[PDB]
Amino acid sequence: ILLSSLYLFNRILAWQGNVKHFYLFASNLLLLFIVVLYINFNTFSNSFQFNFELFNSLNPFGLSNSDISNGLLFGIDGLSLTFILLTVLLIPLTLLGNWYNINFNSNLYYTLVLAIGLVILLNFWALDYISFYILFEATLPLLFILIHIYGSSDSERASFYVLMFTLSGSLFMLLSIVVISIVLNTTNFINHNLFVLSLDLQTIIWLGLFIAIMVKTPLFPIHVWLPVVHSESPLAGSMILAGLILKLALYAILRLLLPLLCEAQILYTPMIYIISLLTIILTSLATLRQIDLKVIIAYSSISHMGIAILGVCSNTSLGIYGSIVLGVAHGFVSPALFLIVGGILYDRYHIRIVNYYKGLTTYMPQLATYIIILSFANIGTPLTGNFTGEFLSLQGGFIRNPIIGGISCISVLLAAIYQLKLTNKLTGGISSIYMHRTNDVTIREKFIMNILIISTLIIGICPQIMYNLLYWTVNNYIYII
Amino acid sequence: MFIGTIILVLSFLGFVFNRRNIILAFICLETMLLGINLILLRNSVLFDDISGSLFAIVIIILAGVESAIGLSLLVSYYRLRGVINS
Amino acid sequence: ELKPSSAIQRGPLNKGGWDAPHALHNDGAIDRYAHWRTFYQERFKYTRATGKSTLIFLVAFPALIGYVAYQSEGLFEFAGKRRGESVTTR
Amino acid sequence: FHPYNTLGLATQSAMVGLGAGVVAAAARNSLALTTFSKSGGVVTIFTGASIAYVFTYCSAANLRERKDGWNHMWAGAATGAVLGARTKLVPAFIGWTVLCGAACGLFGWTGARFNADRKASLEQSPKGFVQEDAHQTFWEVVHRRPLSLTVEQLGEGRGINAVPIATATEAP
Amino acid sequence: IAHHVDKGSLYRLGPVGINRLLNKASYNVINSSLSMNSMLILITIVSLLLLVLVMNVNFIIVIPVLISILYILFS
Amino acid sequence: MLILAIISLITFVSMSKLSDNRAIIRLINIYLILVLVLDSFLYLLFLNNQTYTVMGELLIFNSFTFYIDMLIYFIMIVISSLYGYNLYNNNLYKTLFEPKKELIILFLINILGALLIVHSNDFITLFVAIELQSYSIYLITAIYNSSYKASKASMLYFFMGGILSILIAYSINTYYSVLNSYTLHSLDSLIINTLDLNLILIALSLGLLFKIGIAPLHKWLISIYENTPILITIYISLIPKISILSYLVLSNISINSLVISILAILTLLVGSVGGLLQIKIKRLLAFSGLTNAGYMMLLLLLNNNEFSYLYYITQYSISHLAIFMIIIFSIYYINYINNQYNPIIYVNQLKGLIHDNAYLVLSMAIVVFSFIGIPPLLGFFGKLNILMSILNNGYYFISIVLIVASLISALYYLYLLNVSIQDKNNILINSNETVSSVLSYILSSLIILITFGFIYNSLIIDIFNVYFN
Ligand SMILES: CCCCCCCCCCC(CCCCCCCCCC)(CO[C@H]1O[C@@H](CO)[C@H](O[C@@H]2O[C@@H](CO)[C@H](O)[C@@H](O)[C@@H]2O)[C@@H](O)[C@@H]1O)CO[C@H]1O[C@@H](CO)[C@H](O[C@@H]2O[C@@H](CO)[C@H](O)[C@@H](O)[C@@H]2O)[C@@H](O)[C@H]1O
Ligand SMILES: CCCCC/C=C/C/C=C\CCCCCCCC(=O)O[C@H](COC(=O)CCCCCCCCCCCCCCC)COP(=O)([O-])OCC[N+](C)(C)C
Ligand SMILES: CCCCCCCCCCCCCCCCCC(=O)OC[C@H](COP(=O)(O)OCCN)OC(=O)CCCCCCCCCCCCCCCCC
């Protein structure tokens, strides 16, 4: 199979010359395969189901059935399945959004994009700390290369930011993982809630883990790399980064931190709430005085992640469900806004300064409708998944701490301010003098945006449709005596 | 222990604070080896032990070959420049 | 006498592609304003106003929220509280 | 905790710093009476750093009646203040203060040692799962901890109660 | 906020401040191929001996000396 | 085999003409390969961690030294291939890379010195092996006497090595004067408790460590590495590090040493910070070597460091060989040869290499990200094992400093890739010339090892548990 499929790949490359059709086909097959897996997934059980092990000593190149397990573990539960489905949904759209604007070394570009997508998808399958960390860092070289070669004018500094900040956080994560390894001599996620470390040791390990979470989510005050890396990334890099790599952080909290360091998490929760309220308020305010389109869209994601964090550390089932739903809805909506600003407007006019843009409704009414819909979705209109996520997250946060959650309810207003201030200038007024008329949104762009819009609407009208995968998870991590 | 130690330390200070010539440098190397060996041999005698004297003989031979190689290096260095201005 | 091999033939790096008509009329003033705003960090200096905003937002505001969040931890329980009952636990 | 003798220890530190600055000045001279003329004030650098660090460390340790990393944080802050006064600029002074204080606070937190405290380290400590009902030590792990320990360490409230809810709310 | 905090202080404790700090420190550590190196080796030997003497006396007293030494070398 | 090779080679090189140098070197390359493959089965002696004292208790043989020995042979094979084969067949490369007549004999003798350092059970053997390696490495530095910088380098090296050798001999003799012995095997826990040997043993360790260039005595070695011919630097920067570090690890005479702790910290800081402002390739690589030597120095503070040290030294040897070979290959695409000993000198001379050779830059990226420690490349697991060891033994502050130093050094590691994936105006159109098959295959083998070594991690640890326990 693998030999034959490799032959097929080689022949397609030799004859056609551009791998991108093969990659699109492949990613669609992967999506279908994951859907088949969902069909055969038992939901009346809190146990990992499609388990396999790699690089075991008895079978380094195959799967292990040995009675000693020294390789890397993989498997899924409902929580991993949700994000995996999101990933396989997003990857083909990431390939498709750059279908025409890459005219050089295109095969390498598509290879990097598909590789990053596969790395994240595999990362969600990881079942122990070491493999999780391995696949968690494996993206950074690919992101560095991609941003450096296929990025905009300031792409060199962008690539250095995206590598350095994430390494900086990941190495403290590595300290915590090394401490866990040498203290427990185990690394798995299957039974790691069974080990009850001393409170002081929990308090120490929690620091490294949460520093990694601060850099990767990001949270205030170490969020300054994200707006850059977004603004100078090419479209696929921005869509992947906004839609999957940030959710890797939330998945990291739920999988690595909460089951193992429960008591220390209980001790540290108000500090988390300080940091999340900081990120929400301060980044939302800082968004008001930006002049770049992609930078503003990037700043939106940080605030939504702040609300997600407030949900996920609320020690309530509603808070956790809200954090997950908000993560999924953000993965639907933010790639769409990035598609607009960095693939439609940027590919037509090759500029991102806000002053140039005005009154796009006259020549491009369809693009204006899309902007309006996506912006009201981003600020949390009900019947959109974003609203369900923000509402449930805020419920959990208000329960966990009434004052802090009540103040956090100002995020609704702040989000409306920056987003609608942007869309007001973009859609209306008299058509700009600086730019000329160009085509309206095309069939491909409309297809991608329709996919994202219908996904967010579907989970916004009936968020319950996710519950069958998540009803174990909403109880697996809350710590009430 | 006394004569050897003082030869070692004075040759070391001559080497370090040399700002006169490179020959002084060679000589400080040799005299350091001398002082090391004198300390060694006094200890050999005090212990009535042969291991000390065996290592002294080996130092002698290795200092010989080290001097040979070092002077060869200096000559090869000179061949290109014609003059040693230190 | 040390020169690269004569065997090598070097041509131009052309990037190919179709030169689209230029659909934006760049405004030099806007570009300079954008560049100044984009690289403001290269020229930032600590003064009285800048230091004041720093000490407010990075120090005073976090301290306020921390005092609130550690003082109020576990203070409230609201679920189904009735008349006469204390909504406070301490 | 029995006190550090701040005065004496600071005096010895003054002596050590003066000697170290003298050695640095002699070196500086050799590498470049003029030795102190062309010193660059290194003798003052050493002397001031020594006095500041030692005096602030002992002072803070005595006042708080504790020995931990916070004392090193204060002492590093004082040392950074001394070293950043040389810039003659308020931002640089503040930066030296806060950052040297942070670095030395990290140093004091890890143990205020460059090598390791061998007896406390994991390799020389009781580890693994504990036996029948023994008290938990720092490196040891269990399957269940005593609920009274949870209630005392974490504190009452926010879902931490002496008795499981369902048991407490059972009818008879 | 957006300027003074985000592109101000956070970049100070970020890419820009670190860039300046590393520029200065690196310049200082790079700032007579023999005589100099010989002086270096003597200075290392004597400095190590005196530092360890101090450590035997009292380890707390040597911390400022190490801080000052690093200040000389990097700054 | 090594002694027999040295003797025969002296005879042949005496009786052969200057044109036969490369053929002779190919002969020895194949001979070493044959020895490595046919005599490998002697590992079986070391089953259950069986130790053997040999030559009247002068040499010690265990699994550890057997592995170091095999590694040194592999390194010698790779290094001799660079001299035994031409990259290109043009006049320029005949001028650039020609092997001296006696170079191979010097290489073999320095290898013998390194192996005797590794196996040394007695201080007399240690000192003789140190002096053998030191003399051979002086001469290797000096054999390219047409270079002004190489001769200046050899002289500075002679003097610094002589002083450090005198410090070492002094330490050996003080140990003799206190214990009337020349063996560390005479040492025991009772003896270490009873007597204060700390000063003597630390002086011996420092005398050995300053010979591989740990701070604050680095700069003389970085200058030597900068000023030697590039194919000489590939060797002299590696073998002494391996031999000295392996001896120190095996001896374990500085456990929990406060002075070694402070010096390892200082070495990390200087290697990371000082390499940032560098613009020359080989100075960048030498500061890389300094930082990695710091990572290995940390392992001298603890017991049971065999696995972490072996893994780290192996992956470092592979990465170091590979990065030097990549710099060597990238010479064919530069438009300016600086001189005949060091054809490429400045990092910026690689600018736009991806447009000339995409896969060369792919290999460069792989090796750089190994150095930074990106999983699942080998570099990550090397750093992981080191962190495991030092955290198990309570070196908390040193672990924090190691984190910080890896972060800082990532900057000047990525400097190379950064300039390499930028764009050059004059892009290779075509060429008839083929890079030599053999060296390209070797470079590819190193790259594939770095990339896909991790699949064998669990098998390696299983083997290790039976040969080192
Ligand atoms: C992610 C951010 C990283 C930054 C944080 C790292 C800092 C770690 C600090 C925590 C920690 C090592 C923990 C390492 C765990 C993994 C390491 C994590 C990764 C490493 C990067 C260092 O604890 C240090 O704290 C300093 C104060 O701050 C002290 O400074 C000094 O104070 C003065 C000297 O007395 C001087 O005046 C001066 O010398 C300094 O002032 C040190 O003495 C002290 O060793 C604590 O270790 C130790 O804790 C104790 C009781 O906790 C344990 O023994 C316990 O004994 C009973 C009670 O004792 C308990 O009944 C029992 O149950 C338990 O057996 C020990 O077994 C040991 O384990
Ligand atoms: C037909 C004979 C050919 C054998 C030639 C060997 C040449 C060595 C040259 C370079 C060293 C390169 C890599 C050494 C591998 C370690 C072997 C071992 O397992 O390491 C163990 C000890 O683990 C350790 O400490 C850690 C070792 C650190 C290795 C770091 C790299 C890991 C990734 C390498 C993956 C291997 C590539 C396979 C691709 C299909 C020693 O094993 P051992 O002493 O029992 O000897 C093995 C039996 N032998 C003699 C017949 C071969
Ligand atoms: C470079 C970064 C670091 C690299 C570290 C790890 C690299 C791993 C390389 C990818 C290989 C993993 C994917 C293939 C493994 C699974 C093969 C398999 O057969 O699944 C095993 C599992 C159980 O099957 P079984 O027990 O045999 O019973 C069958 C009953 N009919 O059967 C199942 O339940 C199906 C399992 C589906 C798994 C989905 C995997 C998602 C992505 C697949 C390709 C990913 C390739 C990644 C490439 C980039 C590198 C990360």
Spatial distance between the Cα atoms of A48 and A25, rounded to a whole number of angstroms: 29
Q: How close is the nearest chain A Cα to the Cα of C3, in Å?
A: 30
Whether the Cβ atoms of residue F118 and residue F66 lie closer than 8 Å to each other: no
First to last CA, chain B: 33
State which H helix or E strand residue A73 sits in: strand A72-74
Q: At A115, list the tokens.
A: 């590789």
Torsion angle in degrees (nearest 10) through CA of E57, E59, E65, E67: 180
How is F355-368 classified by DSSP, letter by letter? HH-HHHHHHHHHHH
Q: Which residues of A272-298 are buried (b: 16+ CB within 10 A; e: fewer)?
A: bbbbbbbbbbbbbbbbeebebbbbbbb
Q: At A386, list the tokens.
A: 């974003």
Whether the Cβ atoms of residue A353 and residue C29 lie closer than 8 Å to each other: no
- PDB resolution in Å: 3.4
Breaks (C-N over 2.5 A) in chain E follow: 31
Sign of CA dihedral A120, A124, A126, A128: positive
Sheet containing D128-129: which strands, arranged edge to edge?
Answer: A196-197, D140-142, D128-129
Tell me if D116 and F262 make a contact (CB, 8 A cut-off).
Answer: no
Q: Which domain holds residue B7?
A: 1-86
Find where tokens 């009900």 sit.
Answer: A382
C-alpha separations of A53 from A70, A194, F158, F336 in Å: 9, 22, 55, 52
Spatial distance between the Cα atoms of F36 and A377, rounded to a whole number of angstroms: 67
**Cis check: omega of the bond before A382, within 30 degrees of 0:** no
Ligand 2 atom at minimum distance from F466 CA: 45
Q: At A459, list the tokens.
A: 């989970």
Is the CB of residue E3 less than 8 Å away from at least one CB of chain A?
yes
Q: At A130, list the tokens.
A: 């070491």
Q: Find the helix packing angle between A317-339 and A293-312, rounded to 10°.
A: 170
Spatial distance between the Cα atoms of A245 and A137, rounded to a whole number of angstroms: 11
Spatial distance between the Cα atoms of F133 and F188, rounded to a whole number of angstroms: 30
Chain B contact set for E38 (CB, 8 A): 15-16, 18, 25
Q: At D126, list the tokens.
A: 């009781």
Tell me if E15 and A161 make a contact (CB, 8 A cut-off).
Answer: yes
Tell me if A315 and D141 make a contact (CB, 8 A cut-off).
Answer: no
Q: Is D30 exposed, middle or buried (0-12, 13-18, 19+ CB in 10 A)?
A: middle
Sign of CA dihedral B18, B19, B20, B22: positive
Whether the Cβ atoms of residue A459 and residue A328 lie closer than 8 Å to each other: yes
Q: At F334, list the tokens.
A: 């530069």
Whether the Cβ atoms of residue F267 and residue F215 lie closer than 8 Å to each other: yes
Q: Is F192 exposed, middle or buried (0-12, 13-18, 19+ CB in 10 A)?
A: middle
Q: At D131, list the tokens.
A: 């036996």
Spatial distance between the Cα atoms of A198 and A206, rounded to a whole number of angstroms: 12
Tell me if F384 and A174 make a contact (CB, 8 A cut-off).
Answer: yes
Find where tokens 């949460």 sit.
Answer: A210
Whether the Cβ atoms of residue B19 and residue E35 lie closer than 8 Å to each other: yes
Find where tokens 């992981």 sit.
Answer: F384
Backbone angles phi, psi at F433, to 5 degrees: -65, 140
Whether the Cβ atoms of residue D53 and residue D74 lie closer than 8 Å to each other: no
Spatial distance between the Cα atoms of F131 and F138, rounded to a whole number of angstroms: 10
Spatial distance between the Cα atoms of F246 and F120, rounded to a whole number of angstroms: 11
CA proximity to B58, closest of F3, F2, F129, F138? F129
Q: Is A84 in the pocket of ligand 3 (CB under 6 A)?
A: no
Spatial distance between the Cα atoms of F218 and F229, rounded to a whole number of angstroms: 19
Q: At F35, list the tokens.
A: 């020895």
Ligand 3 atom at minimum distance from A138 CA: 2
Subunits that touch chain F (at least 3 Cβ pairs < 8 angstroms)?
Answer: A, B, C, D, E
Q: Which residues of F134-173 are buried (b: 16+ CB within 10 A; e: fewer)?
A: bbbbbbbbbbbbebebbbbbbbbbbbbbbbbbbbbbbbbb
Spatial distance between the Cα atoms of A398 and A276, rounded to a whole number of angstroms: 13
Whether the Cβ atoms of residue A170 and residue A188 lie closer than 8 Å to each other: no
Q: How close is the nearest chain F Cα to the Cα of C14, in Å?
A: 9
CA proximity to F195, closest of F177, F170, F208? F177
Q: Which residues of E31-41 are buried (b: 16+ CB within 10 A; e: fewer)?
A: eeebbebbbbb
CA proximity to A374, closest of A388, A359, A385? A385
State which H helix or E strand residue A464 sits in: none
Q: At A326, list the tokens.
A: 């908000």
How is B19-78 classified by DSSP, letter by letter? -S-SHHHHHHHHHHHHHHHHHHHHHHHHHT-HHHHHHHHHHHHHHHHHHHHHHHHHHHHH
Which member of A70, A108, A175 has the closest CB to residue F458? A70
Whether the Cβ atoms of residue B69 and residue F161 lie closer than 8 Å to each other: no
Whether the Cβ atoms of residue A441 and residue A344 lie closer than 8 Å to each other: yes
Backbone angles phi, psi at F149, to 5 degrees: -65, -35
Q: Is F393 exposed, middle or buried (0-12, 13-18, 19+ CB in 10 A)?
A: buried
How many domains does chain A divide into?
A: 1
Whether the Cβ atoms of residue F166 and residue B45 lie closer than 8 Å to each other: no
Triad A68, A74, A78: Cα angle to 5°:
130
Residue A44 carries which DSSP code? S
Q: Which residues of F2-11 are buried (b: 16+ CB within 10 A; e: fewer)?
A: beebbeebee
Ligand 2 atom at minimum distance from F461 CA: 23
CA proximity to F317, closest of F373, F360, F275, F378? F378
Strands annotated E in F123-280: none
β A72-74/F59-61 pair status: unpaired
Of all protein residues, the one whose alpha carbon is nearest to atom 1 of ligand 1 is: A208
Distance A71 CA to ligand 3 centre (A): 13
Q: At B86, list the tokens.
A: 């230190």
Is the CB of residue D24 less than 8 Å away from at least one CB of chain E?
yes
Distance A144 CA to ligand 3 centre (A): 25
Q: Is F15 exposed, middle or buried (0-12, 13-18, 19+ CB in 10 A)?
A: exposed
Residue A166 C-beta-side C-alpha neighbours within 13 Å: 28
Triad F40, F42, F48: Cα angle to 5°:
120
Tally of CB atoms within 10 A around D170? 8
Biggest distance spanned by C-alpha atoms of chain A: 73
Spatial distance between the Cα atoms of A347 and C23, rounded to a whole number of angstroms: 11
Spatial distance between the Cα atoms of D113 and F395, rounded to a whole number of angstroms: 9
Spatial distance between the Cα atoms of D109 and F396, rounded to a whole number of angstroms: 9
Q: At F422, list the tokens.
A: 């930028």
**Three-state SS at A439:** coil
Q: Which residue of A69, A74, A134, A187 is the best one to mutate when testing the F interface, meaning the one whose CB has the most F CBs within 10 A?
A: A134
Q: Which domain holds residue F463?
A: 1-469
Residue F432 makes CB contacts below 8 A (sequence gap 6+) with C7
Spatial distance between the Cα atoms of A274 and E46, rounded to a whole number of angstroms: 51
Find where tokens 């025409």 sit.
Answer: A100
Whether the Cβ atoms of residue A464 and residue A393 lie closer than 8 Å to each other: no
Distance F460 CA to ligand 3 centre (A): 23
Residue F55 makes CB contacts below 8 A (sequence gap 6+) with none
Spatial distance between the Cα atoms of D127 and F143, rounded to a whole number of angstroms: 57
Residue type present at position E26: S
How many domains does chain B divide into?
A: 1
Residue F441 makes CB contacts below 8 A (sequence gap 6+) with none
Tell me if C57 and E12 make a contact (CB, 8 A cut-off).
Answer: no
DSSP tally for chain C: helices H, then strands E: 3, 1
Sign of CA dihedral D97, D101, D103, D104: positive
Which value, in Å, is the radius of gyration of the alpha carbons in chain D?
25
Residue A411 C-beta-side C-alpha neighbours within 13 Å: 33
Whether the Cβ atoms of residue F272 and residue F295 lie closer than 8 Å to each other: no
Q: Which residue of D4, D29, D43, D53 is the best one to mutate when testing the E interface, meaning the one whose CB has the most E CBs within 10 A?
A: D53
Backbone angles phi, psi at F33, to 5 degrees: -60, -45
CA proximity to F207, closest of D133, E63, E44? E44
Of all protein residues, the one whose alpha carbon is nearest to atom 39 of ligand 3 is: A122
Residue F61 carries which DSSP code? E
Residue type present at position A426: L
Which value, in Å, is the radius of gyration of the alpha carbons in chain A?
22
Chain E contact set for A290 (CB, 8 A): 2
Residue F191 makes CB contacts below 8 A (sequence gap 6+) with F179, F197
Q: Which residue of E7, E10, E18 is the best one to mutate when testing the C interface, meaning the one whose CB has the most C CBs within 10 A?
A: E7
How many domains does chain F divide into?
A: 1
Q: At A142, list the tokens.
A: 């690919």
CA proximity to A261, closest of A479, A72, A73? A479
Spatial distance between the Cα atoms of F181 and A148, rounded to a whole number of angstroms: 61
Q: How close is the nearest chain C Cα to the Cα of F139, in Å?
A: 27
Residue A374 makes CB contacts below 8 A (sequence gap 6+) with A333, A336, A337, A340, A449, A453
Contacts 24+ apart (CB under 8 A), A439-447: A439/A348, A440/A363, A440/A364, A440/A365, A440/A366, A440/A367, A441/A344, A441/A364, A441/A366, A441/A367, A441/A370, A444/A96, A444/A97, A444/A99, A444/A100, A445/A97, A445/A339, A445/A343, A445/A344, A446/A366, A446/A370, A447/A96
First to last CA, chain C: 89
Residue A372 CA, distance from chain mean position: 23
* Three-state helix/strand/coil letters over A200-260: HHHHHHHHHHHHHHHHHCCCCCCCCHHHHHHHHCCHHHHHHHHHHHHHHHHHHHHHHHCCC
Spatial distance between the Cα atoms of A398 and A414, rounded to a whole number of angstroms: 18
Which member of E5, E11, E16 has the closest CB to residue C58? E5
Backbone angles phi, psi at F151, to 5 degrees: -65, -45
Q: Which domain holds residue A357?
A: 1-481
Method used to obtain the model: cryo-EM
Q: SS3 helix, strand, coil % of chain C, rounded to 5? A: 40, 10, 50
Q: At F273, list the tokens.
A: 């910070």
Find where tokens 């929760």 sit.
Answer: A269
Residue E29 makes CB contacts below 8 A (sequence gap 6+) with E73, E74, F270, F273, F274
Whether the Cβ atoms of residue F318 and residue F443 lie closer than 8 Å to each other: no
Q: At D26, list the tokens.
A: 């002699």
